Design a protein around this motif. Structure first.
Motif, PDB file in Angstrom:
ATOM      1  N   UNK A  10       0.823  -1.198   0.000  1.00  0.00           N
ATOM      2  CA  UNK A  10       0.000   0.000   0.000  1.00  0.00           C
ATOM      3  C   UNK A  10       0.859   1.252   0.000  1.00  0.00           C
ATOM      4  N   UNK A  11       0.535   2.143  -0.928  1.00  0.00           N
ATOM      5  CA  UNK A  11       1.192   3.432  -1.046  1.00  0.00           C
ATOM      6  C   UNK A  11       0.938   4.274   0.205  1.00  0.00           C
ATOM      7  N   UNK A  12       2.010   4.700   0.892  1.00  0.00           N
ATOM      8  CA  UNK A  12       1.828   5.392   2.175  1.00  0.00           C
ATOM      9  C   UNK A  12       1.109   6.727   2.054  1.00  0.00           C
ATOM     10  N   UNK A  13       1.171   7.333   0.874  1.00  0.00           N
ATOM     11  CA  UNK A  13       0.661   8.682   0.695  1.00  0.00           C
ATOM     12  C   UNK A  13      -0.794   8.647   0.199  1.00  0.00           C
ATOM     13  N   UNK A  14      -1.114   7.673  -0.659  1.00  0.00           N
ATOM     14  CA  UNK A  14      -2.455   7.547  -1.252  1.00  0.00           C
ATOM     15  C   UNK A  14      -3.274   6.362  -0.736  1.00  0.00           C
ATOM     16  N   UNK A  15      -2.620   5.417  -0.064  1.00  0.00           N
ATOM     17  CA  UNK A  15      -3.263   4.175   0.371  1.00  0.00           C
ATOM     18  C   UNK A  15      -3.846   3.408  -0.822  1.00  0.00           C
ATOM     19  N   UNK A  16      -3.194   3.530  -1.976  1.00  0.00           N
ATOM     20  CA  UNK A  16      -3.558   2.748  -3.155  1.00  0.00           C
ATOM     21  C   UNK A  16      -2.602   1.573  -3.333  1.00  0.00           C
ATOM     22  N   UNK A  17      -3.140   0.374  -3.626  1.00  0.00           N
ATOM     23  CA  UNK A  17      -2.254  -0.768  -3.873  1.00  0.00           C
ATOM     24  C   UNK A  17      -1.300  -0.531  -5.038  1.00  0.00           C
ATOM     25  N   UNK A  18      -0.007  -0.707  -4.786  1.00  0.00           N
ATOM     26  CA  UNK A  18       1.002  -0.665  -5.834  1.00  0.00           C
ATOM     27  C   UNK A  18       1.628  -2.036  -5.995  1.00  0.00           C
ATOM     28  N   UNK A  19       1.582  -2.546  -7.220  1.00  0.00           N
ATOM     29  CA  UNK A  19       2.168  -3.833  -7.554  1.00  0.00           C
ATOM     30  C   UNK A  19       3.556  -3.644  -8.155  1.00  0.00           C
ATOM     31  N   UNK A  20       4.521  -4.435  -7.690  1.00  0.00           N
ATOM     32  CA  UNK A  20       5.852  -4.439  -8.285  1.00  0.00           C
ATOM     33  C   UNK A  20       5.963  -5.677  -9.171  1.00  0.00           C
TER      34      UNK A  20
END
Lengths: 103, 106, 105, 98, 106, 101, 102
Positions: free
Chosen positions: C38-48
């Motif tokens: 989870x993106x700390x700034x947006x709380x959007x899931x980021x996949x690597x």
């Protein structure tokens, strides 16, 4: 023992070696082998029919059909109607069932 | 032993559930199998590598391949549709390493 | 083993996607999900994602879709190779880049 | 991992149980610590423990009970609301979907 | 114990999944069994030989036989429908060695 | 202290309900089916419920419904009326409103 | 628990078998003891064994063949008949006259 009959289909579907050949649900023979015709590349089925069933008219047909729950396929041989005044020829060893219905 | 074979290639837009050892059939009769599936580095299109039994080596290059499904297990396979031939019109026979140009994805 | 390069992608919902989930083009697996955070700034899931380097000419106009495989409902990423325009010149994705266009479960 | 507490009231918790996950966009961020009926209204109140690193959740956020995979196991989907005031330890998520 | 029996014959167009020892039932209650299935040599029509318990020896010759399926395994059986009797004309009862004329194939 | 108290409920048909079947409010388990018996006078199925004692403010206007998760009893908290002051169910009371399945 | 016997005739017993349960409002009160075809009517006759504690069944009661949950196991639902302010109670050996097949 048995005698041989051939039949060509456009598509044999799930038919395989040792698949049963039946008349009215009664098994009378079996699929001995399935090959693609080398010149036409059409599936030709080779059948082994029990010799006691040797009065099959050449007007008979073969249909690929499915039995029970496992989707097992078989050949339904429908004895064609003959007319004694006209005299229908009987299928012999090595003959071909011309009338077929594919899957 | 194992039956001798020759190689043919075919490109699809999407190979779906097709995998290695997936069968290739003509009129329901298995004549070959999928040996390998790889993405083409220049086109990024799936390329299927087929191993076809050597006895079936008179397949016209006008033939087509279609991805289709068999009964209850959802197994997918390649249906090879035999093309029209005519040497006068120059319909060549497919050889080892050739490509089936006409394909139908699914 | 095939070496790889990394790409990022943000979804609204990654659903049943997990580490080692496959990334495929036209059904052919070309990579896998390395990690999900989870993106700390947006709380959007980021996949690597890890993509095989031999496939290093993916347009930045490409898209990612979360999709399901038939037999067990296991999820994967379908990478749709984006449209290129000979007029515009091919903007290719590089190691560390982000795929902008995504479709969640 | 350290955690902080949040509460939420539902009409029906369905198959929700202890140790049920709380997720944001499918990523697990917390767990159901306890499930109790409100003593005055007898409405189920769920007690959540959320990892402290996720401490910028707006109070406009919502909770939804949803089902994952083949076994029908249920979880809480926390949908981050549009931003305002941040939720702190002991606060209640006002908007819930059973 | 075992119930004694008498024999009846019946011809179908197709016996389907019927086999030897397949049950014969009236209203779901088994009253007999398929003793044999043979193809008539001159007509190639399936002829079923039934063994019916002797205690059920007042079956009118107007009765019928139907091939039907049982629950989950697709097991087939013969449903014997007790035929209409006629107080005015007095319908004949089937005895040992008789044939059931009215049949419904699958 | 006794962990639970008893409530009764009569249905026309209890279906797949059995002993140890759960009783729930809004999905939260608050009790269990202790027993199922036929009323000797009416031959109607009567269920005996054991409810956890902390849940001792259930209005007598509440209802019981047989539902599936294996079957269970969903207890729907009945309407209260400040004007009439609806009676609370106590140990040994009967839930009058029931829904079979 | 002891038992007493009751009989019932159906047109078709379907998937019913011996040891199939007999229930009132879902509560099992007995079991199917036997199923035989009546030699005289060629109708299936079911023999029921009912627990003696349930000995106040009106003779106006009916029997229905019904299905239980996922596996299609069939059972007999005994519907308690109307009594009238005086209906006779069923005793050992009596027959339930009112029956409904599936």
């Amino acid at each position: 023992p048995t005698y041989t009959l051939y039949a060509t289909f456009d598509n044999i579907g799930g038919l395989k070696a040792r698949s049963p050949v039946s008349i009215g649900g009664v098994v009378v023979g079996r699929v001995a082998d399935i090959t693609l015709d080398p010149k036409t590349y059409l599936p030709r089925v080779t059948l082994e029919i029990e010799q006691r069933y040797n009065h099959i008219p050449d007007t008979s047909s073969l249909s690929i059909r499915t039995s029970g729950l496992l989707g097992e396929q078989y050949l339904a041989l429908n004895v064609g109607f003959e007319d004694p005044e006209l005299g229908t020829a009987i299928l012999k060893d090595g003959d071909t069932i011309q009338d077929t219905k594919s899957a």
